[PDB]
Amino acid sequence: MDEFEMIKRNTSEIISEEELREVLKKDEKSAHIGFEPSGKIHLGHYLQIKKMIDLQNAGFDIIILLADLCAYLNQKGELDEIRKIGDYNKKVFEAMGLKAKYVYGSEFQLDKDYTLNVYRLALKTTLKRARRSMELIAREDENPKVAEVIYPIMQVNSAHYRGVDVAVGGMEQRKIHMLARELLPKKVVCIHNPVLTGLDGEGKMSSSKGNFIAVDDSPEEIRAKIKKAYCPAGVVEGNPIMEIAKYFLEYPLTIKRPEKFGGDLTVNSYEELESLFKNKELHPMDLKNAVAEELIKILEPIRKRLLE
Amino acid sequence: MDEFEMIKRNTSEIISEEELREVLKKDEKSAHIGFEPSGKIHLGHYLQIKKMIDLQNAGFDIIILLADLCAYLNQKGELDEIRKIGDYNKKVFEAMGLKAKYVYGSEFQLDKDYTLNVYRLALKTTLKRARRSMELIAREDENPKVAEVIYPIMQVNSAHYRGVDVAVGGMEQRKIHMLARELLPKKVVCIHNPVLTGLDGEGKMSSSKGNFIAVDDSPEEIRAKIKKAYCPAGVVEGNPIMEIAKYFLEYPLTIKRPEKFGGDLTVNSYEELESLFKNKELHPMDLKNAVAEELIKILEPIRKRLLE
Ligand SMILES: N[C@@H](Cc1ccc(O)c([N+](=O)[O-])c1)C(=O)O
Ligand SMILES: N[C@@H](Cc1ccc(O)c([N+](=O)[O-])c1)C(=O)O
Ligand code: NA
Ligand code: NA
Structure with a gap:
C-alpha cells in the first residue's frame, strides 16, 4: 500500500x-x-x-x-x-x-x-x-x-x-x-x-441540521442517536450507519449477536460487511449495536481528553 | 439667492x-x-x-x-x-x-x-x-x-x-x-x-460612447460636433444643444442672425431661449451657431492652460 x-x-x-x-x-x-x-x-x-x-x-x-x-x-x-x-x-x-x-x-x-x-x-x-x-x-x-x-x-x-x-x-x-x-x-x-449522510437519512450531515453524532457525545447519547437512525435492511446507499462502519471502524470487526440470531459474527472487511448487509444476512439492529459500541470506543479517548 | x-x-x-x-x-x-x-x-x-x-x-x-x-x-x-x-x-x-x-x-x-x-x-x-x-x-x-x-x-x-x-x-x-x-x-x-444627452441624441453622453464634446476640443472640432448634433426644431426634451445653452452659457445671451432671418436676438434667460425655441421663433441652425461660438469662448481658457 x-x-x-x-x-x-x-x-x-x-x-x-x-x-x-x-x-x-x-x-x-x-x-x-x-x-x-x-x-x-x-x-x-x-x-x-x-x-x-x-x-x-x-x-x-x-x-x-x-x-x-x-x-x-x-x-x-x-x-x-x-x-x-x-x-x-x-x-x-x-x-x-x-x-x-x-x-x-x-x-x-x-x-x-x-x-x-x-x-x-x-x-x-x-x-x-x-x-x-x-x-x-x-x-x-x-x-x-x-x-x-x-x-x-x-x-x-x-x-x-x-x-x-x-x-x-x-x-x-x-x-x-x-x-x-x-x-x-x-x-x-x-x-x-x-x-x-444525516442520521435520519434525509440529507447530508451538518452542524446546522442537528443530524450528526458529535465526537464528544456521551455513550448514552451515541446509542440513542444510532438506535433512531435511518438504516433500512439490505440498503447501503445513503445509510448513515453503514457509512460509519466504512469510515470509522476497524477490521476485522466482531459483531455480537444472540445465538438465536446466528451468534457472533466476525467480519474481515467493510466490503464483506456490505455484502452481508445487502444479502440481509445481517439485521439493522445487530449492525447498529456493533456500530454504536465500536464508535463509542473510538471516540472515548477524544471525549476523555476534552472532559479532563 | x-x-x-x-x-x-x-x-x-x-x-x-x-x-x-x-x-x-x-x-x-x-x-x-x-x-x-x-x-x-x-x-x-x-x-x-x-x-x-x-x-x-x-x-x-x-x-x-x-x-x-x-x-x-x-x-x-x-x-x-x-x-x-x-x-x-x-x-x-x-x-x-x-x-x-x-x-x-x-x-x-x-x-x-x-x-x-x-x-x-x-x-x-x-x-x-x-x-x-x-x-x-x-x-x-x-x-x-x-x-x-x-x-x-x-x-x-x-x-x-x-x-x-x-x-x-x-x-x-x-x-x-x-x-x-x-x-x-x-x-x-x-x-x-x-x-x-449624447450629441446624436440617442442616449446619454459618455466617454465610452464617443458622443461628447471634450473640454480641450479644438474650436473647429466643437463647431463640427455641434453642426452634426441632434437638434430638432421646437424640441427641447433630449436636445443636447439646448442642454449646453442651459448648463454652460451665460445670459443675457446675444444670438447673431442675418437680418433676413430676423437679425440679432438678445435673450435674457435660458427660460426665454426655451420659449423662443419651442415657439419656433429660433431656428436650430442659429441656436447651434451661437452655442458653438459661446461654448468655444467658455472652454478657451481651459484648452489654453492645457496647451501651455
Ligand atoms: N469553505 C470552508 C472553509 C474554508 C476552507 C478553506 C479555506 O481556505 C477557507 N478560507 O480561505 O477562509 C475557508 C467550509 O465550508 O468550512
Ligand atoms: N462611481 C463613480 C466613481 C466614484 C464616485 C465616488 C466614490 O466614492 C468612488 N469610490 O469610492 O471609489 C468612486 C463614477 O461612476 O465615476
Ligand atoms: Na532529503
Ligand atoms: Na466661526
Missing part, C-alpha cells in the same frame, strides 16, 4: 492523482484544510481530520485554517465570537491526535496584498460561477448577500497565498476548488472527502 | 434639502465627488466640476476622488495605467479653476479597516440591490463579474470613511447613494447633477 494509496483510501476524488504523485516526491510538502468554526465538532469533521492525519503520516506539514473571516462572510456571527469557537475547535482537533499548526483566516486575509488579490480574482470570476460554487456551503438566505460571492474568492486566494501543495475538503468544496485550479498560476492538488 | 439656491441651481435633486441647510450652517464642511479616470474630460465632467466650484464658493472644502480602484473593479484596465489617467484628469480639473484636494481611492481603500468595513457592508447588501445600483455605471459585460457588486459597496464606504458631509455625482450614482444613506449611521447629503 503506497503512501499514495493510504492517502487515497476513503476519499471521493483526488485532483489529480498525477499531481499528487509529483507532490509526494518532495521532502517538504504541506496540506491545509479550512473549517468555518462550528459549535459542535461531528463525525464529518473527524472524517477529514483523519485524512489530515494520513497526510501527516506521509510526511506533509499540516495547517488547519480556522476560517473566521469566511464564517463571518457566511453569516455565522461576529468575528470575536467566531474566533472563540475557532479556539474550541483547535482543542478538539488536538484531542483527536492531530499534529498541526493552526491559523485564523483573519490573521492574513485582510492584508493589503491579499485584498488586492481578491479584487483581481473578482474581475475573473463571474457572479454566476461564484454563486454556483456556493450552493452547498452558503447559509440559506432568501435575499442572497454580496458577502456570499466574496466568500469563494476569499477561499481561492487562501490556497495561493499560503503556498499549500494540497487542499483538503469535503465534496461540497469542489466547485470552489475547481475555480482555484482555473484562476491561479500554480495548480493546487485537491483531495475531496465524501459527505456523510 | 441663498447659498442654498446657488448650490441647488441646475441640479436634478438634493437629498435632502433640510439636511443640506443644516450642513450650510457649519464653519467647516466638506463635499467630495469621485470619478473613474477618463481619457477625455467632457462637458459632463465640467458640469459637475462647476457644481463643486459652487460648493467651494459656499465655503465647502472640496475633495476630488480619483477613483482608481473602482475603475479597476469596473474593468478600466491596470491600476498603474488608471492612475496615470487620474493624474491627467487632475490637471484638467485644475485648468478649470477648481481649488481642491485630490486623493486616489487606492491610497486608503485597501487599508485593513476599510476592507473589514467593505465586508461588513457586503453582509447587509443584497446581490439584487448591488446589481441594480450598478445598472447605469457597470461596464457592459455578458458575463457579469463579482467585481461589479464589490464596486458599489466600495463607494458606499468611501463617503463614510473620509467623513464627507456632502457627496456629489450624476443621477447615475443615485442608487449607490440611496444604499449609502440606508446602510451608514451618518446620512450623507447627496447632490445629483443631470445627465447630459
